[PDB]
Amino acid sequence: PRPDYVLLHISDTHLIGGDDADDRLGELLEQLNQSGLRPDAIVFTGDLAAKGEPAAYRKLRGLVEPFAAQLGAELVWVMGNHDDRAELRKFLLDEAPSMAPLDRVCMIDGLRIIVLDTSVPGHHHGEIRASQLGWLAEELATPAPDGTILALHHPPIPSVLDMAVTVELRDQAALGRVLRGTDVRAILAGHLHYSTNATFVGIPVSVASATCGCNLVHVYPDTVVHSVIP
Amino acid sequence: PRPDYVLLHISDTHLIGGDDADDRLGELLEQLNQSGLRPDAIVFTGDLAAKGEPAAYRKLRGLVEPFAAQLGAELVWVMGNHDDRAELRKFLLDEAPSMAPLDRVCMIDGLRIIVLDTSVPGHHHGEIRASQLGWLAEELATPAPDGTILALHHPPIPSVLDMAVTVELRDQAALGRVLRGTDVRAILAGHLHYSTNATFVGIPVSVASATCGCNLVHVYPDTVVHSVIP
Ligand SMILES: C[As](C)(=O)[O-]
Ligand SMILES: C[As](C)(=O)[O-]
Ligand SMILES: [Br-]
Ligand SMILES: [Br-]
Ligand SMILES: [Br-]
Ligand SMILES: [Br-]
Ligand SMILES: [Br-]
Ligand SMILES: [Br-]
Ligand SMILES: [Br-]
Ligand SMILES: [Br-]
Ligand SMILES: [Fe+3]
Ligand SMILES: [Fe+3]
Ligand SMILES: [Mn+2]
Ligand SMILES: [Mn+2]
Known part of the structure; x- marks a missing residue:
């Protein structure tokens, strides 16, 4: 089965000035380049x-x-x-x-x-x-x-960790009322620094972990597949 | 936010007779026991x-x-x-x-x-x-x-790898007709030996990777959160 679309979902690279997240990302890009x-x-x-x-x-x-x-x-x-x-x-x-x-x-x-x-x-x-x-x-x-x-x-x-609550997305109800019943098929997110998935108003949400691996996203006619690439 | 239910989703332990998947699982159980x-x-x-x-x-x-x-x-x-x-x-x-x-x-x-x-x-x-x-x-x-x-x-x-096609679940349409519109909130699966999520007839499917990490499942009133534990 060929997907309709293929997406790479990368998040939380956290690059700095320069003196490490730099090498972690380089190795990732190199890997994905050699994967074909x-x-x-x-x-x-x-x-x-x-x-x-x-x-x-x-x-x-x-x-x-x-x-x-x-x-x-x-x-x-x-x-x-x-x-x-x-x-x-x-x-x-x-x-x-x-x-x-x-x-x-x-x-x-x-x-x-x-x-x-x-x-x-x-x-x-x-x-x-x-x-x-x-x-x-x-x-x-x-x-x-x-x-x-x-x-x-x-x-x-929902924040499954205490530490995450104070930095979570606030007022989700309002985003929910807008997204409900639209053609939004998937929500790609970061922020958590570990792989997580859930739904929000029936829409699947996929959080990629931090680079400092990533996710492969295959868009099929009737579904969206997210694969965690360590 | 306290979830309604917490589930541990483990898969593909692949234990043998005994002469390794044994130690990999032991370390996991020990980790999760110390996590509280x-x-x-x-x-x-x-x-x-x-x-x-x-x-x-x-x-x-x-x-x-x-x-x-x-x-x-x-x-x-x-x-x-x-x-x-x-x-x-x-x-x-x-x-x-x-x-x-x-x-x-x-x-x-x-x-x-x-x-x-x-x-x-x-x-x-x-x-x-x-x-x-x-x-x-x-x-x-x-x-x-x-x-x-x-x-x-x-x-x-859908099988995103060629190798996976020959061992996939066949006749999914028939399972789909049964699940559609029921109170099934999530489908937990294994088999792929890497973390994957998608939907099947609108229902989120979460595949835990192999032990030979695992997933934490938080069941909330309106959503099910799956977290990948390496
Ligand atoms: C989880 As953070 C402090 O990198 O936004
Ligand atoms: C992917 As298998 C051969 O352990 O079912
Ligand atoms: Br400005
Ligand atoms: Br602003
Ligand atoms: Br625009
Ligand atoms: Br499909
Ligand atoms: Br028998
Ligand atoms: Br049978
Ligand atoms: Br029964
Ligand atoms: Br909820
Ligand atoms: Fe970050
Ligand atoms: Fe297996
Ligand atoms: Mn962040
Ligand atoms: Mn199997």
């Missing part, structure tokens, strides 16, 4: 840079872009709590610096990938602004031919 | 013994029962392709030897756990007999207060 995988997209669900440093984004971009271009894969970057919106826009995206949420829509043929920004500047918990929910609702009003993958950092999933 | 976890049930989703040997089941029973009794957890054993129904019944369950499918229902308070046998004696692929589907349909006609966890070996999930 040819993904349609590579989605990085947040905490890309450990302290949101400019030097870390330039480093990340230099490691990842040759990898993605060789595979012909689309790159999909997501904000995490440790990232800085302005520095990410400047040094990773080549866009004008802004503190506005990093929200974006990306079509892979018939597959829609929506990037949402659950980060809260200067803070570690997650939250989604009313403006973002309106944006998302408007976007989801039109269905994609192959449905939608939602990509964000803070997963809408 | 207190699960309601411990579900083993098949391939318990590598060659279905009597000596392997006695060995498994001797390692696991003291572990389960100390935790006050219910033990839930499932048939895999490498197991032998008769030897498992004799040496693990203290039941009269039979080659009939190992199908069973188990209530944990309001939570129903259904064990299904996807094994095919002498073969490695999975299949479910018409008699079993009738049985299952009849059982699922009455809802459980907290819904149902279905536990089986061969997952109803």
Whole structure:
């Protein structure tokens, strides 16, 4: 059975200035390059840079872009709590610096990938602004031919650890009312630094662990398969 | 947030006669015992013994029962392709030897756990007999207060590897027609020897990797969370 789409789900790389998460990610990219995988997209669900440093984004971009271009894969970057919106826009995206949420829509043929920004500047918990929910609702009003993958950092999933509660995504009910009954087929997330899956308003949520392995995502006609790659 | 139920999902232990999967499982049980976890049930989703040997089941029973009794957890054993129904019944369950499918229902308070046998004696692929589907349909006609966890070996999930196709669960459509619209909240499976999750007729399927880590399952009021424990 050939899947309709193949996605690489990587998260929590936590790169720093430079003096380690650098080598851990290099080895991963090298492994996946030698596996012969040819993904349609590579989605990085947040905490890309450990302290949101400019030097870390330039480093990340230099490691990842040759990898993605060789595979012909689309790159999909997501904000995490440790990232800085302005520095990410400047040094990773080549866009004008802004503190506005990093929200974006990306079509892979018939597959829609929506990037949402659950980060809260200067803070570690997650939250989604009313403006973002309106944006998302408007976007989801039109269905994609192959449905939608939602990509964000803070997963809408109960915190199974005490430590995780204080940095969880807040006000999940509101995101739930927007997502319910839409063509969202899967939610890709990070933040937890261990592999987890659950549903949120009937939609499967898959959290990839930290790089500092990853997940393979096979999109089939009637299901989405997530495989944990150690 | 306290979950309603906590389950331990272990799979593919592959114990042999004795001359290694023995030590790998011992270390796991020891770890989980020192973590302070207190699960309601411990579900083993098949391939318990590598060659279905009597000596392997006695060995498994001797390692696991003291572990389960100390935790006050219910033990839930499932048939895999490498197991032998008769030897498992004799040496693990203290039941009269039979080659009939190992199908069973188990209530944990309001939570129903259904064990299904996807094994095919002498073969490695999975299949479910018409008699079993009738049985299952009849059982699922009455809802459980907290819904149902279905536990089986061969997952109803597309095979993302060529090697896996020839030993996959066959005739999934028929299982699907029975499960659709029931109170089945999650399907626990093994067989793949790596962590995987997907849905099957809208129901989340979680495959635990092989012991030869495991999964923690938190059952919440509105969701089931699966965490991969390396
Ligand atoms: C779990 As964290 C402090 O890397 O967002
Ligand atoms: C994947 As197998 C041969 O242990 O059923
Ligand atoms: Br700015
Ligand atoms: Br904001
Ligand atoms: Br956009
Ligand atoms: Br499918
Ligand atoms: Br017999
Ligand atoms: Br049979
Ligand atoms: Br029964
Ligand atoms: Br819940
Ligand atoms: Fe992180
Ligand atoms: Fe096995
Ligand atoms: Mn985070
Ligand atoms: Mn098996």
